[PDB]
Amino acid sequence: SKVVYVSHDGTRRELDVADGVSLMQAAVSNGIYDIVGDCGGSASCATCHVYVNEAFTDKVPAANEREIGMLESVTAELKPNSRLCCQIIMTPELDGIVVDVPDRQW
Ligand code: FES
């Protein structure tokens, strides 16, 4: 399924992501290193921060307790559509989802 990661400078990086793969996994395995994923994907670091496009936020399961807590530590500006992408698992229903990657993660 289609996923587009927009870098801070506007560059679009499009990937075909399989079901069950997190957006953090797809990003780091494809060189989209503006997403770090330091903790390994267990919502414990906040370095996979992305801004989910407004037309897709309600299609993604809401943040769990752990993610809400970690989001309090994002380094880039927290926005209403901020999510830790290791928490977004790809499904056909999310086909075409666009996420904007902030300029910093650490
Ligand atoms: S990879 Fe650590 S919170 Fe997402």
Side-chain angles (χ1 to χ4, degrees):
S1 305
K2 179 182 182 180
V3 178
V4 182
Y5 300 79
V6 185
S7 68
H8 187 64
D9 85 338
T11 304
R12 304 179 84 73
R13 288 73 59 83
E14 190 187 312
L15 297 180
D16 176 10
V17 183
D19 305 329
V21 179
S22 82
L23 266 53
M24 182 279 272
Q25 289 174 313
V28 303
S29 64
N30 283 279
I32 303 177
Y33 301 128
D34 39 322
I35 281 169
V36 182
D38 192 59
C39 78
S42 55
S44 297
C45 73
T47 68
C48 63
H49 183 201
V50 301
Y51 303 121
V52 177
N53 184 269
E54 301 87 337
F56 292 81
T57 50
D58 71 12
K59 289 180 167 61
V60 180
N64 58 36
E65 199 167 346
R66 194 168 22 159
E67 183 181 354
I68 289 296
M70 281 304 328
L71 280 169
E72 235 100 10
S73 293
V74 291
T75 304
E77 184 189 320
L78 177 77
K79 299 184 183 182
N81 54 331
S82 284
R83 294 296 304 269
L84 298 184
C85 75
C86 63
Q87 300 296 291
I88 305 178
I89 310 309
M90 198 60 183
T91 69
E93 294 71 36
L94 293 179
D95 182 75
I97 185 172
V98 175
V99 302
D100 294 355
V101 188
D103 67 338
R104 68 158 69 202
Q105 297 284 4
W106 305 100

